[PDB]
Design a protein around this ligand. Structure first.
Ligand SMILES: CCCCCCCCCCCCCCCCCC(=O)OC[C@H](COP(=O)([O-])OCC(O)COP(=O)([O-])OC[C@@H](COC(=O)CCCCCCCCCCCCCCCCC)OC(=O)CCCCCCCCCCCCCCCCC)OC(=O)CCCCCCCCCCCCCCCCC
Ligand SMILES: CCCCCCCCCCCCCCCCCC(=O)OC[C@H](COP(=O)([O-])OCC(O)COP(=O)([O-])OC[C@@H](COC(=O)CCCCCCCCCCCCCCCCC)OC(=O)CCCCCCCCCCCCCCCCC)OC(=O)CCCCCCCCCCCCCCCCC
Ligand SMILES: CCCCCCCCCCCCCCCCCC(=O)OC[C@H](COP(=O)([O-])OCC(O)COP(=O)([O-])OC[C@@H](COC(=O)CCCCCCCCCCCCCCCCC)OC(=O)CCCCCCCCCCCCCCCCC)OC(=O)CCCCCCCCCCCCCCCCC
Ligand SMILES: CCCCCCCCCCCCCCCCC[C@@H](O)O[C@H](CO[C@H](O)CCCCCCCCCCCCCCC)COP(=O)(O)OCC[N+](C)(C)C
Ligand SMILES: CCCCCCCCCCCCCCCCC[C@@H](O)O[C@H](CO[C@H](O)CCCCCCCCCCCCCCC)COP(=O)(O)OCC[N+](C)(C)C
Ligand SMILES: CCCCCCCCCCCCCCCCC[C@@H](O)O[C@H](CO[C@H](O)CCCCCCCCCCCCCCC)COP(=O)(O)OCC[N+](C)(C)C
Ligand SMILES: CCCCCCCC/C=C\CCCCCCCC(=O)OC[C@H](COP(=O)(O)OCCN)OC(=O)CCCCCCC/C=C\CCCCCCCC
Ligand SMILES: CCCCCCCC/C=C\CCCCCCCC(=O)OC[C@H](COP(=O)(O)OCCN)OC(=O)CCCCCCC/C=C\CCCCCCCC
Ligand SMILES: CCCCCCCC/C=C\CCCCCCCC(=O)O[C@H](COC(=O)CCCCCCC/C=C/CCCCCCCC)COP(=O)(O)OCCN
Lengths: 121, 54, 459, 98, 52, 140, 56, 63, 347
């Protein structure tokens, strides 16, 4: 796709202003829950490596892992949604601006279309 | 049991693959560590890419 | 479907926070409870499917396999309860974790409305199996067996990924509903021939087809008991399920691309049935029997007629249950004998009568005795192949006779005759083994009353 | 493209071949590297002066500086090799192998 | 890859040396100032493919 | 460069057996020279004479393989009267493998080379027929 | 003993809670595919006087 | 539940997947055309900025 | 060395890479490469010994030759078009020579010979830095000019790199050489998708960096260099061996682990451009990487090798220094497949 050279792009902006026109992901998003699960797994692995009681060694450390993962996941999801919205917008604008290359298909019915029949024997 | 399953079916798919990969690994990894040969090969590949891919 | 997937996931925290002496009880109870929940899926309708959501759907082909998969896990736990007595708590919990992960991957695989998700889970089912085989295996050949099992599968299934992404690029969707509704004929071209081969070989290697079956005896012999049952019962059906799902886009090329595989299977059934006769090992004999039955299933699927599909599904379920039972019995014998050789222990019927009864019932079911679903699937495939060509009956009858011969040879060598004199550690059979055999066999004789539940969507 | 540029590129290629030949005496390898650098300096100077690209007159000097620094670095390494072996033959660096 | 810090900050660290026709000292002109100016103005804001 | 490939491809498949054999011999000789140069650079055997002997034997082996493949494929294409058939290329590849085995003088290499060279030649012919791309241009 | 068996038998409630959660999630996911409720060309039905949706 | 639930759920799912497939085909075609021509926002490789040119007398009339 | 001097040299290496990535002038990019090479040498020689010196001199020779080739390519490009900006190369010979220069810098075959020896001679810490950080500048430069690179040369070099890495990894016993060949194979995988989609290149680079960082940190944690020294680890820290086996399975491309995300995605991209033979070949070749990873896993965790008596004393002492971000690296390199679409972030 290579949207790097897209006109009117701020060189180092994580989230452009126009990205505020899209619905933010819900806080109960399944992907955000998955980031929280990844944070919890990182906490458990950290406890295991340090040779500490895996489930209940540091509650503050596990909470910090979960919170950091959720934070980064939320912002990453916002950026992903904005980029996909940009791709769809460019697609639709281009297909509107070039009607010659995307002609309307002459709609046909199965009654007047001959498909070869291959019997199974 | 013996001739087909234990001998030839083994020889065709798995054993031939194992032998070929072992031979290729021995061939590739056997470098004496001399940079003379390394840079001679570098010159050869530079010449080959210069005259072939253009 | 999430009412099934979520409890299977919750089985992991349940196991890991259990007491050191109560993991088996909790795992068995909740696995059985999960199986009851899975029973609801069996009530399929003559229309399309039970389209639960955009990601999971259930058919009358997926329902029997799903129920069998959910039912197998308690039996695997009861089988593994024996040889894990002297194992540390962490390693036992890891073993149960591997079994639960395998069940979860299989459950997510069998519905998998999209083909790429199906492939992802179909290859994900390979890691826990390899870990189980290579970690908790007795013999020193478990490493080579694991390597064979990994590479035979992966080499076949790697071109399948390329074929699938190509199909998505051209067709535009890999959802099975759209794939079925928008299917178009495949022209006779070299590119289409290689697409056919790529889409078929990945499932034919796992079934397995004759000539690519070298990994199966090794994987079945060197694996522990639970790995053996999960390989023989469910993991072999992945290839057939995938083939019956994916043959919807390969027409009409299959009409002439099935000849090499049909010939290979129809001759390899005879070859492996003959191999079973001259065998010095029990688990190897059962593995070769599984190869023969799966070759018959391959023939049925490649014929591509409604009776073929019905017989294929019935044979899938029946062979899964029968092979699991046979592996259970062989493991119970091996635990007392510690040798794993057919002629080393003889005349066990005089010492263990009820286990002799279980052996007889399992051999009769494997022998395809009416009106068991084994013979239902067998006979459906026989009639379909006879319609395909009148000469197949010769090969199928030869296979039937050899199957009876080696089944009764297995029964007679280990049960009849005079007991071996120098073995005096044949303790009376526990209640666990008898319960395991009963729970293996009773579902078969119960399903013979309602065959329509296992006859697939073309019923 | 006049003959002067062709001769300069020919000199660079000859120096590169000499560097890659590796008879012995790693000092000769460093000498070949610096011959390549000198050819680069001459070619860049000619190109920049020919087109009156005034602000680019900085480029050769800068180049030279950096390249000379590298030469110094290389010499240091060479010295250590000798201090470990007593001589700077290329064939002595064979402890590490593929 | 290319983190365009300069355009974000408007620093002009290294853009003055890129072309012949960009603010030479004492306004000394390049040998091909006119042609480079014409090509640059032709190909500005057009994209690589269309400019080629 | 690509000139030898153009010389080989310009000739019709079913005609001019000698020209096809010459083009295949040239391609084989070039490949043998390249592999000989790499072997010499990476493994200097003992001296100049052994090196020239090794490069000569490698180039001769490769040229013989190419010549046999081209001649056999063209002869089969003419005799069968059915061009654009990958079977001719399969026969050519197996013949080339057979000469490779004869040169190496062991039946195993001969049989393996026949199989794995007939397969490759048949695949090349199929790709030429169907326009398969190895180094695909960046369309999208 | 209450508050003592809980510390040893609290793990048993995990699976049924998961089942209930899965049922709730299934219903919630089904709530997102109501784009054709009572609009199917075959099951198109006039609503009952005290009926708001054909199915939930 | 009743058959109408599954019927209409399947209809909605089929609509969603058909729309997604058509969108994927359109995206592939748009990408191919955009890369071939270069007249859209995608595949806009950078060129030399024209704001860098100096427009002043250059001590020589002929530039 | 002094900690302040080591920190200064590390800052200088990072500053050189940053200067390469953020600059729009060919001369400044060459300056950044020179600064990186100049400051990177003492990092290899932190632990002085003959092996480190020989590895450092091999690395210096290779990098200096690559830099000189790159400068010659820049000179030719300037000659045939008076442009200094990093854009379309405007010349075939200059593009070819710059491609060889960047291949030498990266380590793609047949310029791969220096990687195993340099990795073997130098320490684990030095190796970790060399394997992951060094790749960022040449890959950024290649991504910036991907529209001009000849597909034939890049594709054949990537295929050769994958083949060579897969074949050479089978023979090696030392872990550092295995990592060097793994890096060669991964870069062969990653540079094959440059002509088509650079976003896939960046995604593969990120995933590979995470995986190799995790594996090198695990190797540093259990101070093992040869295979048997790693086999001894299970007797002291079994958790480390289990995590290492999971990471090794991830690095082989096994789904549903994270290492499957790049390959799969990369294949998809090359299928959009009607390139079918090559992705199949690279998959069947990556099977070899999988094989030697599986052999390492068999040696390390899935089996218990004989131990030594003195190991008893090691049971009483704990790892004094803990490296932060190791659990995060393991999690990111193992369980991030379900978040694959986030690659649309143009990472
Ligand atoms: C899916 C994965 C999910 C989790 C991912 C990772 C997280 C945890 C891993 C950290 C490791 C910790 C560990 O070792 O376990 C010990 C620990 C118990 O032992 P311990 O006394 O505490 O400490 C012992 C020491 O840790 C060490 O004990 P030891 O050293 O004495 O024992 C030695 C043992 C120790 O070695 C180990 O135990 C290895 C640890 C596992 C490896 C971690 C891999 C990282 C993640 C990758 C997962 C891959 C998944 C993809 C599928 C492919 C599978 C490979 O080593 C060996 O036995 C040698 C050979 C090993 C056999 C083969 C190894 C295969 C490993 C592959 C694992 C894949 C599945 C992991 C599932 C979770 C396993 C913990 O386990 C736990 O307690 C944690 C388990 C999870 C806790 C859940 C609690 C929360 C639930 C309650 C709330 C309900 C939630 C729902 C809310 C809503 C309800 C309303
Ligand atoms: C369709 C076009 C034509 C066909 C093309 C494809 C055919 C490929 C041919 C060459 C394949 C190479 C590998 C094969 C076996 C290895 C070589 C070997 O030693 O075997 C000797 C073996 C005899 O055993 P031996 O010598 O007594 O055993 C020696 C010791 O046991 C132990 O042996 P050693 O220690 O002396 O090993 C020798 C040494 C040396 O090994 C080598 O020489 C490696 C060969 C690589 C070059 C392959 C040539 C490709 C040319 C491309 C351009 C073509 C333009 C046209 O190996 C090494 O030390 C390590 C080398 C590998 C490490 C990495 C080096 C890679 C460098 C770059 C690779 C290619 C770069 C290309 C451009 C790159 C630009 C980015 O058999 C032979 O004599 C065969 C020689 C050559 C036969 C080739 C057949 C040609 C067929 C053409 C038919 C055309 C039909 C008409 C058109 C349709
Ligand atoms: C995407 C991006 C991919 C990144 C590529 C991978 C990055 C890895 C390179 C980082 C440097 C390597 C390193 O620190 O040791 C490896 C380290 C292993 O730790 P270690 O083996 O215990 O360290 C042994 C050192 O040799 C023991 O060193 P030492 O005894 O000389 O102690 C001096 C220490 C202490 O530093 C100081 O003393 C502070 C004094 C400041 C002086 C001010 C002078 C400035 C003028 O400073 C350092 O160790 C170097 C820190 C450099 C600052 C970087 C910001 O592994 C990592 O650092 C993993 C980094 C995580 C990935 C990067 C960020 C996540 C994305
Ligand atoms: C004399 C009678 C003879 C026949 C007896 C038959 C008894 C059958 C019992 C076995 C049932 C098998 C399990 C069925 C599970 C599938 C159905 C399940 O998923 O439905 C859920 C509901 O399940 C039930 O609420 C809970 C049943 C679970 C328990 C079954 C009974 C046996 C449980 C035994 C557990 C252990 C007992 C104690 C041991 C100590 C969710 O329903 P929902 O999707 O919302 O429905 C939407 C449609 N509505 C709106 C019309 C409802
Ligand atoms: C070993 C254990 C089992 C492994 C799996 C075995 C199954 C693989 C076998 C492949 C199935 C058939 C492959 C090709 C079938 C097409 C029919 C063809 O073979 O017949 C003739 C084809 O002629 C020749 O066969 C050409 C191909 C010859 C080269 C192929 C290799 C043959 C031997 C290699 C065997 C190796 C198999 C195992 C590889 C590891 C008909 O000629 P024609 O009507 O004009 O062309 C028909 C196709 N059209 C219509 C699209 C044009
Ligand atoms: C394991 C997967 C990789 C994980 C990598 C580590 C994660 C932690 C990194 C912390 C945040 C990263 C960046 C910090 C934010 C500020 C920087 C921001 O301004 O950069 C923007 C860009 O943001 C970053 O690119 C996105 C970073 C997100 C990386 C995650 C994607 C991984 C996809 C698959 C795994 C899913 C996530 C798993 C959990 C993290 C500017 O973009 P732009 O200058 O205009 O374009 C340059 C690129 N070009 C030249 C090719 C056009
Ligand atoms: C283009 C090239 C494609 C390459 C395809 C790679 C196939 C993947 C398998 C490669 C394995 C090769 C490794 C090997 O065999 O090494 C020899 C090895 C020596 O044992 P080590 O443990 O390494 O050493 C201990 C004693 N010192 O021999 C063995 O023991 C082999 C044991 C496992 C063999 C498994 C083979 C299974 C392969 C089945 C067929 C799949 C082939 C894939 C391609 C299919 C054909 C298109
Ligand atoms: C696709 C290209 C197809 C190439 C066909 C040739 C491959 C045949 C390999 C099958 C096994 C060969 C065999 O029989 O082994 C014996 C034979 C004798 O061993 P040597 O020690 O070398 O003795 C030489 C003097 N007699 O072994 C060999 O020489 C072959 C070993 C390496 C073959 C690998 C060829 C791979 C070619 C493609 C590389 C890319
Ligand atoms: C247990 C070991 C089993 C090993 C199985 C390996 C064999 C699997 C069958 C071949 C796999 C590769 C097929 C490619 C994937 C399908 C993609 C596809 O269909 O696209 C084709 C492309 O077809 C190909 O490119 C096929 C090239 C094959 C190259 C690799 C050869 C591998 C070995 C071939 C022989 C193996 C066959 C028998 C294997 C039996 C098992 C050993 C369409 O091309 P287009 O570009 O769209 O052209 C349209 C415009 N005319």
């Amino acid at each position: 796709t290579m949207m790097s050279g897209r006109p009117g792009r701020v060189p180092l902006q994580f989230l452009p202003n126009e990205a505020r026109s899209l619905p933010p992901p819900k806080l109960t998003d399944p992907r955000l829950v998955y980031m929280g699960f990844l944070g919890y797994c990182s906490g458990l692995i950290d406890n295991a490596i340090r040779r500490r009681p895996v489930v209940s060694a540091g509650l503050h450390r596990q909470l910090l892992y979960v919170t950091s993962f959720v934070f980064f996941g939320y912002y990453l999801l916002k950026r992903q949604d904005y980029m996909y919205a940009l791709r769809d917008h460019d697609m639709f604008a281009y297909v509107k601006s070039h009607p010659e290359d995307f002609p309307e298909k002459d709609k046909k019915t199965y009654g007047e279309i001959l498909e070869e029949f291959h019997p199974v024997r | 049991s013996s001739l087909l399953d234990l001998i030839w079916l083994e020889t065709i798919l798995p054993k031939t693959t194992s032998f070929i990969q072992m031979k290729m690994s021995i061939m590739v990894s056997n470098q004496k560590g001399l940079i003379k040969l390394y840079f001679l090969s570098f010159l050869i590949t530079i010449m080959i890419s210069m005259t072939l891919f253009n | 479907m999430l009412k099934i997937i979520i409890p299977t996931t919750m089985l992991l925290p349940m196991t890991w926070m259990s007491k050191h002496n109560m993991i088996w009880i909790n795992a068995t109870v909740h696995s059985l409870l999960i199986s009851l929940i899975s029973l609801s899926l069996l009530n399929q309708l003559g229309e399309n499917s039970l389209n639960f959501s955009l990601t999971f759907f259930s058919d009358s082909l997926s329902a029997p396999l799903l129920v069998l998969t959910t039912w197998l896990l308690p039996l695997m736990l009861m089988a593994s309860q024996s040889h894990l007595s002297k194992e540390t708590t962490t390693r036992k919990k890891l073993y149960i974790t591997m079994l639960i992960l395998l069940q979860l991957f299989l459950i997510m695989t069998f519905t998998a409305t999209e083909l790429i998700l199906f492939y992802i889970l179909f290859e994900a089912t390979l890691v826990p199996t390899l870990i189980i085989i290579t970690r908790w295996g007795n013999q020193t050949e478990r490493l080579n067996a694991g390597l064979y099992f990994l590479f035979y599968t992966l080499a076949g299934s790697l071109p399948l990924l390329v074929a699938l992404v190509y199909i998505q690029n051209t067709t535009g969707s890999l959802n099975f509903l759209i794939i079925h509704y928008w299917s178009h004929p495949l022209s006779n071209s070299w590119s289409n021939i290689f697409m056919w081969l790529a889409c078929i070989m990945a499932f034919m290697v796992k079934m397995p087809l004759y000539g690519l079956h070298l990994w199966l005896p090794k994987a079945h012999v060197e694996a522990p008991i639970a790995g053996s049952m999960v390989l023989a019962a469910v993991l072999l059906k992945l290839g057939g399920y995938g083939m019956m799902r994916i043959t919807t886009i390969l027409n009409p090329l299959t009409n002439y691309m099935a000849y090499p595989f049909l010939m290979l299977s129809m001759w390899g059934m005879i070859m492996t049935s003959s191999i079973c006769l001259r065998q010095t090992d029990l688990k190897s004999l059962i593995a070769y029997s599984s190869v023969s039955h799966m070759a018959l299933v391959i023939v049925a699927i490649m014929i591509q007629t409604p009776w073929s599909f019905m017989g294929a599904t019935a044979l899938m379920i029946a062979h899964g249950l029968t092979s699991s039972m046979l592996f259970c019995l062989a493991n119970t014998n091996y635990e007392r004998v510690h040798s794993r050789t057919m002629i080393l222990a003889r005349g066990l019927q005089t010492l263990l009568p009820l286990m002799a009864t279980w052996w007889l019932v399992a051999s009769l079911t494997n022998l395809a005795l009416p009106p068991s679903i084994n013979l239902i699937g067998e006979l459906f495939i026989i009639t379909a192949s006879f319609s395909w060509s009148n000469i197949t009956i010769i090969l199928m009858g030869m296979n039937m006779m050899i199957t009876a011969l080696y089944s009764l040879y297995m029964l007679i060598t280990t049960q009849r005759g005079k007991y071996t004199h120098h073995i005096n550690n044949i303790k009376p059979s526990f209640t666990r083994e008898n319960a395991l055999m009963a729970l293996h066999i009773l579902p078969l004789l119960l399903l013979t009353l309602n065959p329509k539940m296992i006859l697939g969507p073309l019923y | 493209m006049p003959l002067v540029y062709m001769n300069i590129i020919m000199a660079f290629a000859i120096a590169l071949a000499g560097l890659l030949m590796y008879r012995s005496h790693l000092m000769s390898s460093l000498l070949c590297l610096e011959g390549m650098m000198l050819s680069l300096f001459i070619m860049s100077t000619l190109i920049i002066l020919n087109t009156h690209f005034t602000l680019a007159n900085m480029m050769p000097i800068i180049l030279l500086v950096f390249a000379a620094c590298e030469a110094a670095l290389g010499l240091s390494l060479l010295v250590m090799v000798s201090n470990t072996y007593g001589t700077d033959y290329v064939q002595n660096l064979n402890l590490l192998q593929c | 890859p290319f983190f365009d810090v300069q355009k974000r900050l408007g620093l002009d660290l290294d853009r003055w040396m890129t072309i012949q026709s960009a603010e030479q000292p004492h306004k000394i002109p390049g040998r091909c100032h006119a042609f480079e100016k014409e090509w640059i103005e032709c190909a500005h804001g057009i994209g690589g493919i269309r400019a080629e | 460069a690509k000139t030898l490939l153009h010389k080989y491809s310009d000739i019709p498949e079913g005609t001019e057996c000698h020209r096809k054999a010459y083009a295949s011999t040239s391609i084989g000789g070039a490949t043998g020279l390249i592999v000989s140069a790499y072997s010499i650079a990476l493994k200097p055997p003992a001296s100049f004479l052994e090196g020239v002997a090794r490069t000569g034997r490698y180039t001769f082996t490769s040229a013989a393989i190419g010549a046999i493949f081209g001649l056999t494929s063209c002869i089969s294409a003419q005799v069968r009267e059915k061009p654009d058939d990958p079977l001719n290329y399969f026969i050519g590849g197996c013949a080339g493998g057979l000469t490779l085995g004869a040169r190496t003088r062991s039946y195993g290499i001969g049989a393996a080379a026949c199989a794995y060279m007939g397969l490759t030649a048949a695949l090349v012919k199929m790709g030429q027929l169907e326009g398969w791309q190895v180094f695909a241009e960046p369309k999208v | 003993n209450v508050l003592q068996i809980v510390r040893d038998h609290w793990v048993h409630i995990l699976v049924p809670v998961g089942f209930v959660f899965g049922c709730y999630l299934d219903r919630r996911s089904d709530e997102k595919l109501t784009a054709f409720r009572n609009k199917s060309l075959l099951f198109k039905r006039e609503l009952r006087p005290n009926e708001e949706v054909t199915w939930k | 539940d009743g058959p109408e639930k599954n019927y209409e759920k399947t209809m909605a799912i089929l609509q969603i997947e058909a729309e997604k497939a058509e969108l994927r085909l359109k995206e592939l075609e748009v990408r191919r055309l955009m890369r071939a021509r270069g007249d859209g926002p995608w595949y806009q490789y950078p060129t030399i900025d024209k704001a860098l040119i100096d427009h002043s007398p250059k001590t020589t009339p002929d530039n | 060395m002094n900690p302040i001097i080591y920190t200064t040299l590390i800052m200088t290496v990072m500053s050189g890479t940053m200067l390469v990535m953020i600059s729009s002038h060919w001369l400044l990019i060459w300056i950044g490469f020179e600064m990186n090479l100049l400051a990177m040498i003492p990092v290899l020689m932190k632990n002085f010994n003959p092996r480190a010196t020989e590895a450092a001199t091999k690395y210096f020779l290779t990098q200096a030759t690559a830099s000189m080739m790159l400068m010659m390519a820049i000179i030719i490009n300037l000659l045939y078009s008076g442009q200094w900006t990093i854009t379309k190369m405007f010349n075939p010979v200059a593009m070819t020579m710059m491609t060889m220069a960047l291949a030498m810098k990266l380590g793609l075959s047949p310029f791969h010979f220096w990687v195993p020896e340099v990795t073997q001679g130098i320490s684990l810490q030095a190796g970790l830095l060399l394997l992951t950080w060094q790749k960022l500048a040449p890959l950024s430069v290649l991504c910036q000019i991907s529209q001009s690179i000849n597909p034939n040369l890049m594709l054949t070099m990537a295929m050769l790199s994958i083949l060579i890495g897969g074949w050479g990894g089978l023979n090696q016993t030392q872990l550092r050489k295995i990592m060097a060949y793994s890096s060669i194979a991964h870069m062969g995988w990653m540079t094959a998708v440059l002509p088509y989609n650079t976003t896939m290149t960046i995604l593969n680079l990120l995933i590979y960096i995470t995986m190799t960082l995790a594996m090198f940190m695990l190797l540093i944690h259990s101070s093992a260099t040869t295979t048997l020294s790693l086999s001894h680890t299970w007797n002291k820290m079994p958790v480390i061996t289990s995590l290492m086996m999971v990471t090794l399975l991830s690095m082989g491309g096994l789904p549903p682990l994270s290492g499957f995300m790049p390959k799969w995605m990369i294949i998809q991209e090359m299928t959009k451009n009607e390139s079918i033979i090559m992705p199949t070949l690279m998959a069947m070749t990556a099977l070899l990487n999988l094989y030697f990873y599986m052999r390492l896993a068999y040696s390390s965790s899935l089996t218990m090798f004989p131990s030594t008596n003195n190991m008893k004393m090691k049971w009483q002492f704990e790892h004094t220094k803990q490296m932060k971000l190791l659990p995060t690296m393991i999690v990111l390199s193992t369980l991030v497949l379900p978040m694959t679409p986030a690659l649309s972030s143009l990472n």
